[PDB]
Amino acid sequence: MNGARKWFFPDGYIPNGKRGYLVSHESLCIMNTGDETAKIRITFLFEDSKPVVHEVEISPMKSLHLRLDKLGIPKCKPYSIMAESNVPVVMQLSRLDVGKNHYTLMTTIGYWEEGS
């Protein structure tokens, strides 16, 4: 099976703090253990705005740590993620919240469905 075709992450938020050259961010980590390249449609849902959809690809037997703070998503704006792939993959979302006086990480494997 090598994963699932749909992944969901309800708690999305790009903090705006930084420390030196290290900036707060979220990384949507995706892995493809299959033999086919994965085309993934990433839908971002907001609290009072319409959805925004991005697209990425990940080659066979490769990892991809996608920096969500580089997609034009407004910083400090709550959102949720729905990712749909044409082939099974596995995803995990991690957040780094840093500032002059703080530095913390949090992570979770996502909720999955479709060819689990």
Instruction: List the single partner that 70 binds among Cl ion, Mg ion, its own copies, none, CB under 5 to 8 Å by kind.
Output: none
Whether residue 45 is annotated as binding a ligand: the answer is no
* Cβ(61)–Cβ(33) below 8 Å: yes
* Binders in 4-33 for its own copies, by CB under 8 A: 4, 6, 8-13, 27, 29-33
Could you tell me how many helices (H) and strands (E) the chain has, helices first? 0, 10
Binding Cl ion (rule: CB under 5 A), the pick from 108, 111, 113, 116 is 108
Residues in contact with 101: Cβ distance below 8 Å, sequence separation at least 6, in sequence order: none
* Binders in 50-109 for Mg ion, by CB under 5 A: 104, 106, 108
* Torsion region of 24: left, alpha or beta (phi above 0 gives left; psi -120 to 50 gives alpha): beta
Of 34-42, 48-56, 62-70, 107-115, the segment contacting Cl ion by CB under 5 A is: 107-115
Q: Name which of 69 and 97 has its Cβ closer to its own copies.
A: 97
Q: How many CB atoms lie within 10 A of CB 110?
A: 19
Binding-site residue positions for Mg(2+): 104-105, 107
